[PDB]
């Protein structure tokens, strides 16, 4: 048994049963191993979710780091876009990443993000809050997208849905566009907000 | 038995057992009725979750509507703040609100949000995007902090760390200042960026 085999079987199990189904007991069963063999690789469900979150960042978070020469605006925009793709990559992906934490192996990346933003003129405090805001908006975006996909299949059709006109125009617009335009516009509002604040200082 | 009683006993059960423990089955036992009697009030768990979320808004979301004389910036700031209070009113509150669909009893409120923001100069598309972004940011801020509170107790305390200096100063600052200040700073950055966009147009 290898870390890569445990992580890929767990991400397959996540897509089969969702996050509440994913338990170390059911993963050991899936792998065909007794619970103590698995415990050596994964101590508990918190360690398994932290490892699945980092695997999804290693596969999809292409802008975890700023690129050399990139503007701070482009970095923060591209970072949220790739982090969104990591959360979308699996069933209940955003719930798997919620509350996770980097390992020491990622600290150099986070340091580099801060060094980059502060080189471009942010205070440490405002670099922290720009990173925090873009990731919290992105997590909220995908948590709601994923749960809407589940919920909309569970709810019975109302006989008649008598909806006032601006609301109907707005939900039809969102449906026609899908989630990405509203996501990108929100993200761009954050970046415009940080630029106001930075220019001011 | 009426729907108010079903909702109040389900909110009491949510605080006792959490969202995963909230079953139609334990709700019936708590109301003294057979499980099929609840069907008529709530057809399945998603209908129950929708009613619980909407009762939390009806109790706590004091800025669901714009208030007389408010600017659009005070309405969006105050809306995010009172939405956060509704999400924090119960155990696993934000998990219950994810993916909720309003009923027709909420449509006047939502139409009035869009009439107000378009009277205050937004296009209907950008009023949808601003409301979307405030609420997604708020859901991500509350869910991440509530998950961190639980996840930090499930990780073993390391004998080794080795944390680079900007990252150590940043996490120390965030912890000292608190997650509520971080939420208000991101909220403000969104509001400032909506203002930059409205001007440029």
């Amino acid at each position: 048994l290898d870390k890569s085999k445990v992580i890929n079987s767990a991400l397959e199990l996540l897509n089969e049963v969702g996050i509440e189904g994913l338990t170390t007991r059911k993963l050991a069963q899936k792998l065909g191993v007794e619970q103590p063999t698995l415990y050596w690789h994964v101590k508990n469900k918190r360690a398994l979710l932290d490892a699945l979150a980092i695997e999804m960042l290693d596969r999809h978070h292409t802008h975890f780091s700023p690129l050399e020469g990139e503007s701070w605006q482009d970095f923060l925009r591209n970072n949220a876009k790739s982090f969104r793709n990591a959360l979308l990559s699996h069933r209940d992906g955003a719930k798997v990443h919620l509350g996770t934490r980097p390992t020491e192996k990622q600290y150099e990346t986070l340091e580099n993000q801060l060094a980059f933003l502060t080189q471009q003129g942010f205070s440490l405090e405002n670099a922290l809050y720009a990173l925090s805001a873009v990731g919290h908006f992105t997590l909220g975006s995908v948590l709601e997208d994923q749960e809407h996909q589940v919920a909309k299949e569970e709810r019975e059709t109302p006989t008649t849905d008598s909806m006032p006109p601006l609301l109907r125009q707005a939900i039809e617009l969102f449906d026609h566009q899908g989630a990405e335009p509203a996501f990108l516009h929100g993200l761009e509002s954050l970046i415009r907000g940080f630029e106001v604040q930075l220019t001011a200082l | 038995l009426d729907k108010s009683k079903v909702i109040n006993s389900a909110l009491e059960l949510l605080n006792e057992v959490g969202i995963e423990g909230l079953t139609t089955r334990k709700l019936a036992q708590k109301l003294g009725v057979e499980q099929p009697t609840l069907y008529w009030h709530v057809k399945n768990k998603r209908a129950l979750l929708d009613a619980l979320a909407i009762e939390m808004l009806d109790r706590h979301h004091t800025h669901f509507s714009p208030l007389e004389g408010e600017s659009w910036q005070d309405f969006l700031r105050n809306n995010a703040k009172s939405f956060r209070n509704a999400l924090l009113s119960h155990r696993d509150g934000a998990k219950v609100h994810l993916g909720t669909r309003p009923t027709e009893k909420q449509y006047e409120t939502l139409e009035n949000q869009l009439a107000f923001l378009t009277q205050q100069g937004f296009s209907l598309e950008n009023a949808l995007y601003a409301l979307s972004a405030v609420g997604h940011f708020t859901l991500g801020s509350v869910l991440e902090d509530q998950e961190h509170q639980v996840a930090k107790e499930e990780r073993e305390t390391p004998t080794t760390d080795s944390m680079p200096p900007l990252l150590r100063q940043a996490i120390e600052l965030f912890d000292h200042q608190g997650a509520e200040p971080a939420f208000l700073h991101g909220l403000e950055s969104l509001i400032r960026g909506f203002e930059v966009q409205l001007t440029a147009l």
Partner: peptide, 14 residues
């Protein structure tokens, strides 16, 4: 323990 207390402080993960 400083190390123990720091490991409990929130850190972003993106």
């Amino acid at each position: 323990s400083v190390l123990a207390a720091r490991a409990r402080m929130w850190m972003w993960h993106w």
